């Protein structure tokens, strides 16, 4: 093979089918691992009297001659792991008095001969894990008093009888984790003194075994993945030197109030699923904890003496309990992370977190905390993260928070106070409840601050309207709409003598668009009063009734105008076809009522108008009330399509002219100015297309109230009826 100078022959992977020859007799480590050897002939190793480590790890070995391993009295380590031995080679390994380690873990061993392991007076490491045996070889193991490590992990041992390991007085480590163990007798672990590691992880344990009481020197115990539910008090009486318990993923119900008593060297305790536990465990005598974790229980209190002891405590997880009050955390100078989420916490006292240096992460999420003291963080050390999400807060302290890096207040909707960026100098990731509160931080000064609710353009930091262009456009549109609609209404209602249906529709449409003019004027005046400081007024405007009033005004005006246009087209169709003033007035009243109901629908709903200071629901909001937006868009489309097809049929079947021209102008302009509003309303929900929020807001502002400032000018300067009625008014006033 590949002979080596250090007398360590490595024949791995050579593919030979026998014991290699032509090797120095003074070799001390022979490796025949990966090749294919199926049997060891008699006196196979007669040429290696000084062999010390034999590794047959990987051959398809299936038979060993009784005299094959004879004469290797200097052998110390033997490895036969991945072969296909069907049983422990009892007769093959006889006489190897100097053997100290045996690997048989991966064989397909199904039965251990009774007289096996005879003469192995120096054995100290045994591997039998991944075999398939049903019972612990009690009698074969009774002949190995010097054993110090045993593994029967992946076997199929159903249970362990009494006095199985009686003579293993020097055992140290026992691994039975992935075994299919279902029960353990009271005296199974008998005589296993100075045992420092026990693994029973994936067994099918029903209850907690009582054999542990016979392991006075246990240090690490693993029974985490069993089907254990009950851990009665006193389960660790006979283990004063215990240091580690693994009890995760086993569904527990009751763990007892005194399970972990006077455990001096325990350094961890993570209990999950203990639903029926409602009292804090008796931790007296356990003062070396590092991380304490009691997640799922019904605990409602914490002993005030918690920090008097356990000075080494670092992590405190008490989340899924129902904790109302909080004691004083004075002490616990090494306490690092605190989780108090999903409890029911009413108020934070001033001295709860007094001192307590090195406290970095403190979670207070999902707790109905309506009161936080003003100076509950002045005496706190370097605290990196701070989350108070979903806490129903009414105010927030400022002192001592400059060192914060990440602060989260996502769920505190009632927190309407304005935060100050003068304090959170080092703040990096802020999550305010309302997007207006993060204006002072210049969302996306001294550093870069990332705000979770994006400010964007739909939440104007300084100017609701935007640039001077949009400002003056909206200003003059509102002025024209209001003044001309008022003048048209005055001229129309000065007479109150002639009431043709077409002029009735004209007057009603003017009235409807007057409300849109009024709402645009409200927006302009709000922008004028709040110049550069609109983010301050944003929360007030959204949460106040002004948003509801504006949203109503706008929606009612739009729907009233649409319904009036539809009914005017219906009347024109009836006139073309061939007395009906009463039914037309009734239809107009019904349309007014329907528009009022449509405008009031968001008032019945919750938060539809709160999408933006525009307070128009569907343009700036697409996901909330998406069904309502779709229904209103479809209704508007149906009305426009019906009026369009009626007009088309009228012009087809027909060759008062001013009324026809005004109806045509009105329908064309209304369709032209109404399509982009719906398109931009549905724009954000379309993933494929991306439109800037500034453009969306400008388009909405310049398109929604356009008919209000357009139609009265048309009616005034596109009809001699205006001149005739003005002469009539002049005669009336003179």
């Amino acid at each position, epitope marked *: 093979c590949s002979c080596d100078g250090d007398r360590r022959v490595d024949c791995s992977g050579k593919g030979l089918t026998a014991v290699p020859e032509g090797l120095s007799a003074f070799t001390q480590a022979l490796d025949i691992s990966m090749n294919n050897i199926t049997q060891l002939p008699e006196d196979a190793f007669k040429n290696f009297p000084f062999l010390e480590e034999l590794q047959l790890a990987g051959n398809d070995l299936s038979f060993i001659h009784p005299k094959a391993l004879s004469g290797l009295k200097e052998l110390k380590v033997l490895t036969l792991q991945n072969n296909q031995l*069907k*049983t422990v080679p009892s007769e093959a390994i006889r006489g190897l008095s100097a053997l100290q380690s045996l690997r048989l873990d991966a064989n397909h061993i199904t039965s251990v001969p009774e007289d096996s392991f005879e003469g192995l007076v120096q054995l100290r490491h045994l591997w039998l894990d991944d075999n398939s045996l049903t019972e612990v070889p009690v009698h074969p193991l009774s002949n190995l008093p010097t054993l110090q490590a045993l593994t029967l992990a992946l076997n199929k041992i159903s249970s362990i009888p009494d006095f199985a390991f009686t003579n293993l007085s020097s055992l140290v480590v026992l691994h039975l984790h992935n075994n299919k163990i279902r029960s353990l007798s009271q005296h199974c672990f008998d005589g296993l003194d100075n045992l420092e590691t026990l693994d029973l992880n994936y067994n099918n344990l029903g209850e907690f075994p009582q054999a542990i009481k016979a392991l006075p020197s246990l240090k690490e115990l693993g029974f985490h993945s069993n089907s254990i539910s009950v851990i009665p008090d006193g389960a660790f009486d006979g283990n004063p030197l215990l240091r580690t318990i693994h009890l995760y993923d086993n569904p527990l119900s009751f763990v007892g109030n005194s399970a972990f008593h006077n455990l001096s060297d325990l350094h961890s305790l993570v209990i999950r699923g203990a639903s029926m536990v409602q009292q804090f465990p008796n931790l007296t005598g356990t003062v070396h904890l590092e991380s304490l974790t009691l997640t799922g229980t019904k605990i409602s209190s914490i002993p005030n003496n918690l920090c008097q002891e356990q000075k080494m405590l670092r992590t405190l997880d008490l989340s899924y309990n129902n904790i109302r009050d909080l004691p004083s955390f004075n002490g616990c100078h090494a306490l690092e992370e605190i989780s108090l989420q999903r409890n029911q916490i009413y108020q934070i006292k001033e001295g709860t977190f007094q001192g307590l240096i090195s406290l970095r992460i403190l979670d207070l999420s999902r707790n109905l905390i309506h009161e936080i003291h003003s100076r509950a963080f002045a005496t706190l050390g370097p605290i990196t993260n701070l989350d108070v999400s979903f806490n129903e807060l009414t105010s927030f302290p400022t002192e001592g928070l400059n060192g914060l890096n990440q602060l989260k207040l996502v769920g505190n909707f009632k927190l309407k106070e304005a935060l100050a960026a003068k304090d959170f100098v080092n703040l990096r990731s802020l999550s305010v409840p309302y997007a207006y509160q993060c204006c002072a931080f210049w969302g996306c000064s001294q550093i870069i601050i990332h705000c979770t609710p994006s400010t964007g353009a739909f939440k104007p930091c300084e100017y609701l309207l935007g640039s001077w262009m949009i400002r003056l456009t909206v200003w003059f549109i509102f002025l024209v709409a209001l003044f001309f609609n008022l003048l048209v209404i005055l001229t129309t209602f000065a007479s109150c003598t002639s009431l043709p249906s077409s002029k009735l529709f004209i007057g009603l449409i003017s009235v409807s668009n007057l409300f849109m003019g009024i709402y645009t004027g409200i927006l302009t005046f709000l922008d004028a009063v709040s110049w550069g400081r609109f983010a301050e007024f944003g929360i007030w405007w959204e949460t106040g009734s002004g948003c509801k009033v504006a949203g109503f005004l706008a929606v009612f005006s739009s729907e009233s105008a649409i319904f009036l246009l539809m009914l005017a087209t219906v009347e024109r169709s009836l006139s073309a076809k061939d007395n009906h003033l009463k039914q037309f007035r009734v239809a107009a009243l019904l349309a007014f009522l329907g528009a009022t109901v449509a405008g009031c629908f968001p008032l019945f709903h919750r938060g539809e108008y709160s999408a933006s200071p525009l307070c128009l629901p569907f343009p700036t909001g697409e996901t909330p009330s998406l069904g309502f937006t779709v229904t209103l868009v479809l209704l508007n489309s149906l009305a426009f399509l019906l009026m369009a097809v009626i007009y088309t049929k009228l012009y087809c079947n027909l060759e008062q002219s001013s009324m026809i021209k005004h109806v045509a102008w009105l329908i064309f302009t209304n369709c032209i100015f109404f399509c982009p509003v719906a398109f931009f309303s549905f724009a954000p929900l379309i993933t494929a297309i991306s439109i800037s929020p500034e453009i969306m807001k400008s388009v909405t502002l310049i398109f929604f109230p356009l008919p209000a400032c357009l139609n009265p000018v048309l009616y005034v300067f596109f009809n001699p009826k205006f001149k005739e009625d003005w002469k009539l008014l002049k005669r009336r006033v003179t």
Partner: nanobody
Amino acid sequence: SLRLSCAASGYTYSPYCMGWFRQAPGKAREGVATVDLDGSTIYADSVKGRFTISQDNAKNTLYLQMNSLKPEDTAMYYCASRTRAGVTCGLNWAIFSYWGQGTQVTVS
């Protein structure tokens, strides 16, 4: 049909748990018949009925008679024995302390 004959030429006394094994090419050795010192016999599932065993301590000879040889019987046959006692008999190959040279048998 053949009668394999095995002789304990150098054995001193007390033949304890003799047996017969067959080996396939490049495979493990499987027991076909085990005879205890009390005359009790243990036969393989694919063997019982077809084969018979007989031990005579007067000549210390073990005879394994074979009949109705199916082509699955072609293998190298060995006889194995264990002088020192203290273990339970069976078809395991890890208990016998002495093995024969074995003859190749094929259907003929």
